[PDB]
Point group: C2
Chain length 289, copies 2
C-alpha cells in the first residue's frame, strides 16, 4: 500500500526517501541531495538523478518535494528535482526565522526574501498533504532546528514517520541542538511526541553514521527507540537529557558543509544569483560564527 | 662544511606545512618563510597560534625579522605574512610572476578592479638571481617554476665565508619532496611538469652537500631536510637517470588521480593579496568567495 525507498549518500550520510502510493502512482521525495565538493566548488547531480530514474521506472508522479528541516550537512536538490519531475516544495513555516538569521550572516541583501516565498508550501503543525490514498501529516518537532517537521504517513495506524534529525537509530541516539534556534529541552519534548505514536510505527532517519562499524541502517520503530535509544530511551528524564545534550554539543565542531548548505537551503535550494562575470559564488563569512 | 646559519622548522599538523625561521646569530637578523594563518574551513574561523609560535621564537632569540618570504602562492594554507609584518617587521617578498597568478585568480574570484594584478600588495617582487642581505648571510632567489609559475627556491650562504663554512641551505618550496615521496603536483593553473623537471635539475646542480628544506611533510616524526646528493640518488620520481619525457608522463598521470587541496579556494584568494583578507562588505563582515562549477 505504502512503499518507502531510502537512498543513502556516503559523502554526507544523508538518507533521501521516495514515498510511493502503489495504488495511484503518486509520489513524494524527501530530503534530496545535490552533490557538492567543498574543496573544488563543483556540484554533481548523481544522487538526485537516482531518485529521478526510480520515479520514471515506477511510472510515478511526484506531487511533493518535502524538507524535514533546513539542512546544515548537505545541499538540497529540490529545485533541480522540481524542474525534472514536478511537484511542490514544502517545509515548516519557521523556515522564515532561519531566513532572518542567515540572511543577515551571509549579507544576502534585499533580493533575498525572508517570508519563505522561495518554497511552494509553508507547513504548520497538523497540516495534511494528500498523496493518492495516503495522507501525510506535518508534525512540528523542533529542537535540532526551530523549523523541524516529522512527516507522519497513513492510509487516509500502520504508520511510517520521516523524523528528519529528531531521532537517529537507537544505537546512535539524538542530534545536536546547537544550530541557531536549536534547543535540547524542545528536542526532548518533540521526541516524546514522536514516541507517543503507536509502537509499531516505522521511523525513517535522515542520517546514519554506522556506530561501531555496523551496516548502514535507517529504519527503526517507536518500540525499538523507547527500548534501546542510548540517549532518550524510556526512563531518561528531561533535565538529564538536556544536561547530556548540552555538554555533548559544547564539544562538537561545525559540520563540514554548514556554510555552503545553509545559504543554499535557506533559498529552497536555489544557488546564489550569478555575479556580473556569470559565475555564482558561495560566501564564507570570516570570524562571524 | 655548513654556514653559521640557524634554521628552525615549524610543522603544522592541519596542513602539513613547514614554516621556517632563518637566523644569523652573529647579527641577529632573521627571515620567516612560508608562514601559516590557521584557518578552519568548516566555520570560517581564523587563529594565530602558528604565527604566534614564530613570533615567540623570534623574541626569545633577540632576533629582528627583515624578510617575510613566500616560496610561491600557496594552495594549501593561508599565509600569515601581514599579521607577522605588523608584529615583527620585515618586508613581504615573493617571485615577480605572482602577477600572472593574480591575473588568473582575480578573474576566478571576480575580485574586480580594487584588486591589483601588479604585485603591489607585496613589498618586494623577486627576479631570478636577486640577492637579499641577512646580516652575515646572503639569500639568492632562484626561479624554479613548475608546481606554479612563480615558485622561487631561496639559496642561503655566508656572504663572506671561510673555507670550511661554504655549504648552502636551500628552501625549495614545493618542488622536491623528501626522496621517498618524490615531487609535487603540476596541475595548478600555469603549472607544468616539464618546467618542474628542469627546475629540479637546476636545484640538483647545486653542490652535493647543499641542505634542502622542504615546504611540506605529508608522511609524518618530521622530516625537514634532505640534501642534493641524497635526492639525486634516491628520489623516487626524479633521481638521476629519469628522463624528462618519462617524468612528464608519470607526473601528468599522477596529477590526474588527485583531488583538489582542501583549502585551495580560501588559500589562493587570500595569498594572491599577500595574505590580506578580503575587504569587508557593507555590514562589516569579510567573506571568502567560493566559485561554483568554475574550476
Ligand atoms: Ca540536520
Ligand atoms: Ca604548494
Ligand atoms: Cl521579506
Ligand atoms: Cl540560539
Ligand atoms: Cl594552464
Amino acid at each position: 500500500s505504502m512503499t518507502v525507498e531510502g537512498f543513502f549518500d556516503p559523502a554526507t550520510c544523508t538518507i533521501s526517501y521516495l514515498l510511493f502510493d502503489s495504488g495511484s502512482g503518486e509520489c513524494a521525495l524527501i530530503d534530496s541531495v545535490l552533490d557538492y565538493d567543498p574543496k573544488s566548488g563543483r556540484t554533481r547531480t548523481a544522487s538526485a538523478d537516482q531518485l529521478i530514474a526510480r520515479v520514471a521506472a515506477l511510472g510515478a508522479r511526484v506531487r511533493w518535494l518535502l524538507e524535514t528541516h533546513v539542512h546544515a550537512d548537505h545541499l538540497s536538490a529540490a529545485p533541480y528535482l522540481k524542474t525534472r519531475v514536478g511537484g511542490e516544495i514544502a517545509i515548516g513555516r519557521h523556515v522564515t526565522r532561519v531566513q532572518d538569521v542567515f540572511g543577515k550572516l551571509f549579507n544576502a541583501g534585499p533580493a533575498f526574501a525572508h517570508d519563505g516565498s522561495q518554497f511552494d508550501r509553508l507547513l504548520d503543525d497538523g497540516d495534511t498533504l494528500a498523496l493518492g490514498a495516503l495522507s501525510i501529516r506535518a508534525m512540528h518537532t523542533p529542537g535540532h532546528t526551530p523549523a523541524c517537521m516529522t512527516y507522519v504517513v497513513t492510509e487516509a495506524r500502520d504508520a511510517a514517520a520521516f523524523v528528519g534529525d529528531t531521532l537517529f537509530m537507537p544505537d546512535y541516539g539524538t542530534a545536536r541542538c546547537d544550530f541557531p534556534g536549536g534547543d535540547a529541552r524542545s528536542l526532548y519534548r518533540s521526541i516524546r511526541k514522536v514516541l507517543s505514536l503507536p509502537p509499531a510505527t516505522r521511523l525513517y532517519m535522515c542520517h546514519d553514521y554506522q556506530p561501531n562499524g555496523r551496516a548502514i541502517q535507517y529504519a527503526s520503530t517507536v518500540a525499538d527507540e523507547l527500548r534501546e535509544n542510548v540517549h532518550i530511551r524510556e526512563g531518561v528524564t528531561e533535565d538529564d537529557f538536556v544536561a547530556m545534550r548540552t555538554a555533548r554539543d559544547a564539544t562538537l565542531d561545525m559540520p563540514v558543509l554548514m556554510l555552503p548548505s545553509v545559504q543554499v537551503n535557506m533559498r529552497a535550494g536555489r544557488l546564489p544569483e550569478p555575479e556580473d562575470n556569470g559565475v555564482r559564488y558561495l560566501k564564507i563569512p570570516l570570524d562571524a560564527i
